[PDB]
Amino acid sequence: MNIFEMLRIDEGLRLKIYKDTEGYYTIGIGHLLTKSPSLNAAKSELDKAIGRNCNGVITKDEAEKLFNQDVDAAVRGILRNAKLKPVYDSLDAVRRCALINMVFQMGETGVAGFTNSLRMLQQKRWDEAAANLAKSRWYNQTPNRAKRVITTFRTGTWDAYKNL
């Protein structure tokens, strides 16, 4: 298992514009298009992102390309973030994947807001951190995904995903 297969499980793949769990216009593998209510604003963002008139639909290849960019930008964002970088550097390879997943879903800024949990992860207090991460809107809104990520941080294995 790797970051790509992990995120593909969590986000799914959709070739037509869709609304995400928060109601935002998205396409592909969790690629947010716009927080705007206009399908039109979404179609425009899409065409801008792919470089062709897509008419709200993309190919598998196009989705994978967006996905590659997004994973890349997620990692680079963690590496540039003063709060995130140290945590990331302190973690093992599996746990690094769990942090990248949060960043991909909720953005750098959102994750950087989890001050206490970040401190616990840095300290390698697995159980305490899993419990603290669960006290968030994130866990309440997308509990199955949050549980998978949380288990990954707690155990440092891919057990939560070997099921799936």
* Contact status, residue 71 vs residue 4, Cβ threshold 8 Å: yes
Residue 38 assigned to a binding site: no
Residue 132 assigned to a binding site: yes
* Domains defined along the chain, listed by start: 1-164 (1.10.530.40)
User: Kind of pairing, strands 25-28 and 31-34?
Assistant: antiparallel
Q: How many residues are given for the chain?
A: 164
Q: What is the resolution of this structure in A?
A: 1.7
Residue 90 assigned to a binding site: no
**Experimental technique behind these coordinates:** X-ray
Question: Which is nearest to 150 in space by CA: 160, 163, 140, 137?
Answer: 160
Among 5, 10, 11, 159, the one annotated catalytic: 11
Among 5, 10, 20, 70, the one annotated catalytic: 20
Residue 117 assigned to a binding site: yes
11: number of Cβ within 10 Å: 20
Query: Active site includes 62?
Result: no
CA dihedral 14, 15, 17, 19 (to 10 degrees): 0
